[PDB]
Amino acid sequence: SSPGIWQLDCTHLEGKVILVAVHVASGYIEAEVIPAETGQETAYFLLKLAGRWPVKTVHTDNGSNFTSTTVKAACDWAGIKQEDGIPVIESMNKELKKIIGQVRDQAEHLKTAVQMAVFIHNHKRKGGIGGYSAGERIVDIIATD
Amino acid sequence: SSPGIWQLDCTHLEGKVILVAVHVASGYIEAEVIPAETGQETAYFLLKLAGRWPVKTVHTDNGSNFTSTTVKAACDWAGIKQEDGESMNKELKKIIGQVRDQAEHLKTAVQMAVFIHNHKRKGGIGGYSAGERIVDIIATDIQ
Ligand SMILES: Cn1ncc(CO)c1-c1ccccc1
């Protein structure tokens, strides 16, 4: 689908909250542990995302952190179309948790283990030895020239 | 320069620390406000960077934050070569001033500045933004 389309969700592990943005066309992920699923935390994560990739549209789970006017304000500022409650990706949250289990014993804190897992996911060749990683795919899809 | 070379810098503002990474060939920036310039905050910044972009080499200032065993452990794990030997960085500070009033806290103004820097077209019609350049450089290098 469009190069500018992201899906945002949340997943919970060890009592902490991980916000995950998936670039729908490529399966590339961005993720971070945050203190809680608040408006101010969600808006900050989105503003960081939109400053790093060209984000036109976000699909959300319509959680209350999304309905907040702080999130709406960020999205307006960044020119992002927020599509709440609009639905390979339900087992993205599952995929990321698995990878986190494989590195968890190399890091003292969960937040570091999440970043390791993001690194592994985005570098992973899919479709066997002849294939491409989510990382290669997102840049091929969004490059304008 | 090569597609995998970054330069990393700290800058100090309104009483806080900003870590700034410039992708040298594109001028694209990543930045984060951190409470203090520690070896743990550095390593965490570097790992987030390397899971996002193909980081092969980072050029840094001499600081002990870049020297610490945790940054060395992160660099070895992520495959980053470290080397301890600024026009997009004065630029970033200048943008922070121009929008500092658009926002409540520093953290937010910094990410608005990164947004504006990376999306801004340079030159006239036919030009590119830094965000366009990095993606183009790296996509070309893959093919
Ligand atoms: C209406 N709504 N609100 C939140 C969600 C979760 O995507 C949904 C939804 C669930 C399944 C299919 C379509 C929307």
Side-chain angles (χ1 to χ4, degrees):
Chain A
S1 229
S2 157
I5 307 183
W6 295 76
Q7 183 86 27
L8 269 274
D9 208 8
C10 67
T11 195
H12 290 266
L13 189 73
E14 285 172 33
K16 303 203 166 38
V17 189
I18 297 149
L19 246 48
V20 183
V22 179
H23 181 251
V24 175
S26 66
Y28 175 94
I29 59 179
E30 293 251 356
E32 275 217 285
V33 167
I34 62 174
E37 258 179 279
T38 73
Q40 296 65 28
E41 285 306 315
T42 308
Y44 187 66
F45 175 86
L46 280 161
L47 169 70
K48 292 192 295 177
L49 184 67
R52 294 165 173 62
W53 296 103
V55 176
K56 190 165 145 196
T57 302
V58 304
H59 287 166
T60 81
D61 62 9
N62 194 223
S64 67
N65 50 321
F66 295 106
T67 51
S68 89
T69 62
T70 306
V71 172
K72 293 197 227 78
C75 274
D76 284 345
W77 187 91
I80 287 173
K81 299 167 53 204
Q82 180 179 348
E83 301 185 358
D84 301 307
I86 282 75
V88 65
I89 299 177
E90 72 294 301
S91 79
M92 200 58 83
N93 281 177
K94 198 160 154 220
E95 156 80 338
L96 175 76
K97 269 178 188 206
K98 182 158 79 146
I99 297 178
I100 288 165
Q102 287 153 11
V103 291
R104 186 60 187 89
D105 74 5
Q106 283 182 70
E108 302 298 295
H109 308 300
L110 167 77
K111 59 192 293 220
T112 304
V114 176
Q115 311 302 316
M116 299 170 71
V118 171
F119 185 112
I120 288 174
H121 176 75
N122 285 340
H123 287 83
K124 188 183 191 206
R125 183 161 300 170
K126 304 274 188 39
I129 209 66
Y132 293 91
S133 59
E136 282 163 336
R137 286 181 231 122
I138 189 168
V139 300
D140 185 63
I141 292 164
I142 78 180
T144 58
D145 301 83
Chain B
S1 273
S2 149
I5 306 176
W6 294 75
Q7 183 141 343
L8 179 50
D9 247 89
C10 62
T11 191
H12 297 258
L13 212 50
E14 289 173 31
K16 234 140 147 206
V17 197
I18 307 157
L19 270 167
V20 184
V22 198
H23 178 259
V24 174
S26 61
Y28 175 84
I29 282 175
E30 300 253 351
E32 296 265 351
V33 181
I34 58 183
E37 190 171 359
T38 61
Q40 309 295 143
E41 290 296 6
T42 310
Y44 180 72
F45 181 93
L46 286 166
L47 285 183
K48 292 208 293 209
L49 190 78
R52 288 138 195 80
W53 296 107
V55 176
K56 175 210 185 144
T57 297
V58 305
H59 295 285
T60 87
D61 72 27
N62 37 59
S64 52
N65 62 300
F66 291 105
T67 226
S68 72
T69 58
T70 272
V71 163
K72 284 173 147 66
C75 289
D76 171 296
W77 185 83
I80 296 169
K81 198 50 168 180
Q82 203 160 184
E83 282 172 11
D84 306 0
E86 211 227 37
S87 68
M88 308 269 56
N89 191 289
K90 281 207 133 214
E91 187 60 347
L92 187 85
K93 223 161 217 193
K94 188 175 192 164
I95 295 161
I96 296 156
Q98 309 184 334
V99 292
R100 189 53 186 97
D101 78 1
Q102 295 210 27
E104 357 85 13
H105 224 181
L106 212 220
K107 233 175 168 216
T108 301
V110 170
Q111 299 308 333
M112 289 170 48
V114 166
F115 179 111
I116 289 157
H117 174 75
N118 279 341
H119 276 78
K120 186 166 143 144
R121 191 183 69 258
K122 329 209 192 198
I125 296 195
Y128 295 90
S129 68
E132 286 165 342
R133 300 192 301 262
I134 188 173
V135 169
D136 282 347
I137 290 166
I138 293 162
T140 291
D141 186 73
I142 299 160
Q143 294 139 72

